[PDB]
């Protein structure tokens, strides 16, 4: 599949996502951003079927933005992740289900803690220190199982990530054209435009 990774450190959540977009025999793009911002402090990465993927993310986006405008308040990550799990659990038993897996990372300004959520097209939701969708988990979970600590700093976390992206480029069959990283914290969402050699 595509590379969708997520790690929650001390005061932020980091999301890494493959930049490649291959269609059959040709790699059509090497700069794709498999993510959508749902609110100032909530980001969601996704991977799955060709159309479903974007249509779902944007749909979820539109709804969370609408809640924000209507309530002039930003829903906690936990709540946003509950809305998403619900949407997928509906989809799973609908006529033509959404085949999209997502990682939701946000900073709860009220609890003042970062949170990471992993949800699959079935509507399976689980909260984790670090997670991934697709095969990525297969080579990265043991790395993180080994080198992960809850109090790590965003810098420490960004290194642990580079470690994972390295193992993935070494053992994974596909050329995913590197990853795009993003940090979510008390101050919002920013992208680490320098990881192609960090």
């Amino acid at each position: 599949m595509d590379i969708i990774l997520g790690i929650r450190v001390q005061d932020s959540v980091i999301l890494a996502s493959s930049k490649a977009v291959t269609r059959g025999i040709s790699v059509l793009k090497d700069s794709d951003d498999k993510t959508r911002q749902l609110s100032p402090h909530t980001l969601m990465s996704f991977a799955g079927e060709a159309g479903d993927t974007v249509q779902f993310a944007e749909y979820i986006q539109a709804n969370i933005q609408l809640y924000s405008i209507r309530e002039d308040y930003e829903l906690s990550p936990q709540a946003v992740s509950s809305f998403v799990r619900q949407e997928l659990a509906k989809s799973i038993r609908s006529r033509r289900p959404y085949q999209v897996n997502v990682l939701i990372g946000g900073y709860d300004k009220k609890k003042n803690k970062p949170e990471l959520y992993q949800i699959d097209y079935l509507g399976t939701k689980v909260e984790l220190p670090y997670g991934a969708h697709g095969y990525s988990g297969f080579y990265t979970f043991s790395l993180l199982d080994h080198h992960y600590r809850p109090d790590m700093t965003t810098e420490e976390g960004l290194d642990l990530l580079k470690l994972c992206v390295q193992e993935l480029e070494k053992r994974m069959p596909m050329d995913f054209k590197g990853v795009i990283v993003k940090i979510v914290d008390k101050d919002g969402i920013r992208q680490v435009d320098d990881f192609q050699a960090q």
């Binding site: 977009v21 269609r23 025999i25 040709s26 793009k29 060709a50 479903d52 974007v54 033509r96």
Partner: protein
């Protein structure tokens, strides 16, 4: 079918072939794989002929209606999403189309959007779609520079299709060129591959393998 479109200094270049098949049978060598959505927008035909020709003409209507309604020329990003959303409404039904929506709006500049019946919509600088896409990528990829003259870029296109028309059995007929500027697009003739091949061989010395 081979269709390409790339962005560069002089704007956008669009080149396509004109072969239509039904198995090993060549139905037509005179197909127009470039749908002229309007004086500033272009569509490319790859995948199912009717699916593209029809839904793209439909797109044109939708765009025109948007302009009457909004008293403002439609953006390329939006015309691409109308096609994108329509096609996704039929996801699973069997539509077959791989297309590129190309345009130049004062607000976005030169822009290219890839849109297939899978629901995939991608913005990018270079795109090759069709059964001859890899052959055009080969040529195009290794001779592309944002700094191509509108004349050298035009040639690189024409030549990228020639490459694909040769190797790919499903591509051929003639080449159709378009230049995308903000004032709109400019047609740059129909080039029968029949003659263009020989010409390029002689003048360029390429296709050395073939016996002339």
């Amino acid at each position: 079918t081979t269709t390409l479109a790339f962005r560069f200094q002089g704007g956008i270049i669009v080149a396509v072939d004109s072969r239509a098949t039904a198995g090993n049978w060549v139905a037509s060598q005179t197909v127009k794989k470039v749908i002229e959505i309007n004086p500033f927008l272009l569509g490319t035909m790859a995948g199912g002929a009717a699916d593209c020709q029809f839904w793209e003409t439909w797109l044109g209507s939708q765009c025109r209606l948007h302009e009457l309604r909004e008293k403002e020329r439609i953006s390329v990003a939006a015309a691409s999403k109308i096609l994108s959303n329509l096609v996704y409404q039929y996801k699973g039904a069997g539509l077959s189309m791989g297309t590129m929506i190309c345009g130049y709006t004062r607000k976005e500049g030169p822009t290219i959007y890839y849109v297939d019946s899978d629901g995939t919509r991608l913005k990018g600088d270079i795109f090759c779609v069709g059964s001859g896409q890899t052959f055009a990528y080969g040529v195009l990829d290794s001779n592309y520079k944002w700094d191509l003259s509108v004349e050298d870029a035009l040639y690189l296109g024409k030549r990228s299709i020639l490459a694909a028309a040769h190797r790919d059995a499903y591509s051929g007929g003639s080449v159709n060129l378009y230049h995308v500027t903000e004032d709109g697009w400019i047609y740059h003739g129909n080039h029968d591959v029949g003659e263009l091949f020989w010409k390029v061989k002689e003048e360029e010395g390429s296709f050395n393998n073939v016996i002339g």
